Structures are given as structure tokens and as C-alpha cells.
Write a protein that holds these residues in place. Sequence first.
Motif, PDB file in Angstrom:
ATOM      1  N   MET A   1       2.396  -8.709   0.832  1.00 17.73           N
ATOM      2  CA  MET A   1       3.128  -7.876   1.813  1.00 17.73           C
ATOM      3  C   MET A   1       4.059  -6.909   1.101  1.00 17.73           C
ATOM      4  O   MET A   1       4.925  -7.322   0.330  1.00 17.73           O
ATOM      5  CB  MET A   1       3.947  -8.741   2.769  1.00 17.73           C
ATOM      6  N   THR A   2       3.891  -5.627   1.368  1.00 12.26           N
ATOM      7  CA  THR A   2       4.741  -4.614   0.771  1.00 12.26           C
ATOM      8  C   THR A   2       5.877  -4.262   1.722  1.00 12.26           C
ATOM      9  O   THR A   2       5.874  -4.679   2.883  1.00 12.26           O
ATOM     10  CB  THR A   2       3.944  -3.343   0.416  1.00 12.26           C
ATOM     11  N   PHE A   3       6.844  -3.502   1.233  1.00 20.08           N
ATOM     12  CA  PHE A   3       7.977  -3.105   2.054  1.00 20.08           C
ATOM     13  C   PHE A   3       7.515  -2.177   3.171  1.00 20.08           C
ATOM     14  O   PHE A   3       8.001  -2.254   4.297  1.00 20.08           O
ATOM     15  CB  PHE A   3       9.047  -2.423   1.197  1.00 20.08           C
ATOM     16  N   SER A   4       6.551  -1.324   2.853  1.00 18.75           N
ATOM     17  CA  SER A   4       5.997  -0.389   3.823  1.00 18.75           C
ATOM     18  C   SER A   4       5.308  -1.151   4.961  1.00 18.75           C
ATOM     19  O   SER A   4       5.487  -0.832   6.137  1.00 18.75           O
ATOM     20  CB  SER A   4       5.007   0.556   3.127  1.00 18.75           C
ATOM     21  N   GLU A   5       4.541  -2.178   4.601  1.00 17.67           N
ATOM     22  CA  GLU A   5       3.853  -3.003   5.583  1.00 17.67           C
ATOM     23  C   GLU A   5       4.848  -3.757   6.458  1.00 17.67           C
ATOM     24  O   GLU A   5       4.759  -3.734   7.685  1.00 17.67           O
ATOM     25  CB  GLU A   5       2.958  -4.015   4.879  1.00 17.67           C
ATOM     26  N   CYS A   6       5.803  -4.410   5.813  1.00 13.97           N
ATOM     27  CA  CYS A   6       6.756  -5.261   6.511  1.00 13.97           C
ATOM     28  C   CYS A   6       7.643  -4.440   7.435  1.00 13.97           C
ATOM     29  O   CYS A   6       7.961  -4.865   8.548  1.00 13.97           O
ATOM     30  CB  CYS A   6       7.614  -6.011   5.504  1.00 13.97           C
ATOM     31  N   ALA A   7       8.044  -3.273   6.960  1.00 17.19           N
ATOM     32  CA  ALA A   7       8.823  -2.345   7.771  1.00 17.19           C
ATOM     33  C   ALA A   7       8.068  -1.987   9.046  1.00 17.19           C
ATOM     34  O   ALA A   7       8.636  -2.006  10.140  1.00 17.19           O
ATOM     35  CB  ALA A   7       9.150  -1.088   6.982  1.00 17.19           C
ATOM     36  N   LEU A  42       5.956  -1.730  -3.091  1.00 13.63           N
ATOM     37  CA  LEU A  42       6.463  -2.936  -3.719  1.00 13.63           C
ATOM     38  C   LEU A  42       6.566  -4.041  -2.677  1.00 13.63           C
ATOM     39  O   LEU A  42       6.664  -3.762  -1.483  1.00 13.63           O
ATOM     40  CB  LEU A  42       7.826  -2.679  -4.367  1.00 13.63           C
ATOM     41  N   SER A  43       6.524  -5.286  -3.122  1.00 12.93           N
ATOM     42  CA  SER A  43       6.598  -6.417  -2.212  1.00 12.93           C
ATOM     43  C   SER A  43       7.943  -6.440  -1.504  1.00 12.93           C
ATOM     44  O   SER A  43       8.983  -6.220  -2.127  1.00 12.93           O
ATOM     45  CB  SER A  43       6.388  -7.731  -2.967  1.00 12.93           C
TER      46      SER A  43
END
Length: 106
Positions: A1-7, A42-43
Amino acid sequence: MTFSECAALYIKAHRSSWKNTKHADQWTNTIKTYCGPVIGPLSVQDVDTKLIMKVLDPIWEQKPETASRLRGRIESVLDWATVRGYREGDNPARWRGYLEHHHHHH
């Protein structure tokens, strides 16, 4: 999970509260633009305070208002990510006292 995904997941989990309106877009767009090329791929778990400060510091020069506003968004997303279980612990964007000594507030 990247920051972009989680956001984006944070956004999706609040889409119902955000219409259809472009507020969700504004969240996505701002993060993709400012944090994207840095901590985006980044994760979300490996997001560190160093990484965040690297992004925000340049921003203070140009858009201090946006830096303040973006910091709040990052806090909300990472807080959610911790609850959801994508990083655990606490947030690096929490800050135990920023702008301290010089201003802060009270």
C-alpha cells in the motif's frame, strides 16, 4: 500500500460525506501534486517525519497557507490509515509542537 493508494482510500471512505462534489478531487489533486512525486509511490506505512518535512519546508516559502492546510490533510489520512491498519502506531505528521519557540500559538 502506497501513500497515494491509502490517501485515495481515505477519500473513498468519505465519498458519501463529500457529495458528488470536487472536494474529493481537491484532496486527491493536492496530494498527487505536492506529495505525489515524493512520498506518493512510497508505502503509507514507511512514510516518515523526515519525508514530510522535506516536502513542507519548500512549501513554507511559496505557500505557507497551503503547507498548513496540507499538513492537516496528511494528519487525517494517516490517522485513518492507522485505524484501518495500514501502518499502526502513531503519525509522523502529528507533531508534538510545530513552529514552537518562535510562534506556535498557545
